[PDB]
Amino acid sequence: MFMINVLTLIIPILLAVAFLTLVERKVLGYMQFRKGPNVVGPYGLLQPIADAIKLFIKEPLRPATSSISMFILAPILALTLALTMWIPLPMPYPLINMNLGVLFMLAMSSLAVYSILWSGWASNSKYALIGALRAVAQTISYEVTLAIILLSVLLMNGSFTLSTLIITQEQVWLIFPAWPLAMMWFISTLAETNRAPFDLTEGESELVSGFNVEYAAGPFALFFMAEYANIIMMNIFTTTLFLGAFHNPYMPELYTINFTIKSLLLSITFLWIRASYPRFRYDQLMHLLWKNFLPLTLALCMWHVSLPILLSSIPPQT
């Protein structure tokens, strides 16, 4: 009975990741004054299926790898972490109700850079490794503000428990006391998943994404679907964290409908940010972290430490 619940978590994750590619190509189509796919299925609904079947019967590209073991383990680790980030998410009930779900998700997302690092090791090109080290330095840079913004918000929650964060936001959305934390959170999660305007691997400002370079890389579909699982998950986590919905304990479907609509709007906001801006240069998003976001994050961290003490609004532990 529990394995049924695990599978009804993880298989609709993969189906939602499949149709996020359709939603991306359509919404980026209409924002670019064109259409997205509408030929392959009715209104494009067979495009993820056709594209997945195409990617699964396509040849392994040309080259060989430096390390077979890490070439195998990097997509395994990427997909495993991308699936385990969903199990403490209270929607309205988490699959694995743990006392430290926030800290669990922060730790498992900190583990996600090893897939990038091991895919940089496993490629033969010494330039793809440099691109991987740039990506690792980017992701570990924005994990700092993820941790401190998350701590500053949890000072109004009382615990690391994700299910308590529904109870915390019963009177107001938590974006009202913490909107600067919320906007730096949203941009930092955008910079976490290598998502535009922070996608330097998939774009220019890159020493190796330069057309007729070497570097045996993994099967693209696995890292791609791990990345879109991470995108939907970080938007659901932002929805739980700042825009927490009404929960009737006798009707859980009201909360599920409400957080689902908000998470869809927030993922479409990712789609609408990537179709609106040019890319940062690498030192420009290093600037944006280290000289812009981190001073405000430390200042608001001091503020959200000292603020429940001065307002007599310290939340309960339980």
Binding site: I76, I96, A137, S159
Partner: protein, 104 residues
């Protein structure tokens, strides 16, 4: 226990997807293709070390939502603002001595 079952299930589904994505495109026999240190940067290593040290400072900051529940609140607030201030002082020394340069 249910956590271990879930981790094993996620690891199994991931390994199954990886094994399919490596062995399913080997079904179609293809034409066998017969034709035909990295430079160091100090700034790349320095941003990683700056990450590590600020991450240890964050590791000090993580018990704050439990630390606000104490009865010694004046000492707690002093040491909380002092850890965030020492993180800010580490950032200011990293700023002013040209440490955040060309990866700013």
């Amino acid at each position: 226990m249910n956590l271990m079952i879930t981790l094993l299930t996620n690891f199994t589904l991931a390994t199954l997807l990886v094994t399919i994505a490596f062995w399913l495109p080997q079904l179609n026999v293809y034409s066998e293709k017969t034709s035909p240190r990295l430079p160091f940067s100090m700034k790349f290593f320095l941003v990683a070390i700056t990450f590590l040290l600020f991450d240890l400072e964050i590791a000090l900051l993580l018990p704050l939502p439990w630390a606000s529940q104490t009865t010694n609140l004046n000492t707690m607030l002093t040491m909380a603002l002092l850890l965030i201030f020492l993180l800010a002082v580490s950032l200011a020394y990293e700023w002013t001595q040209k440490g955040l340069e060309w990866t700013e």
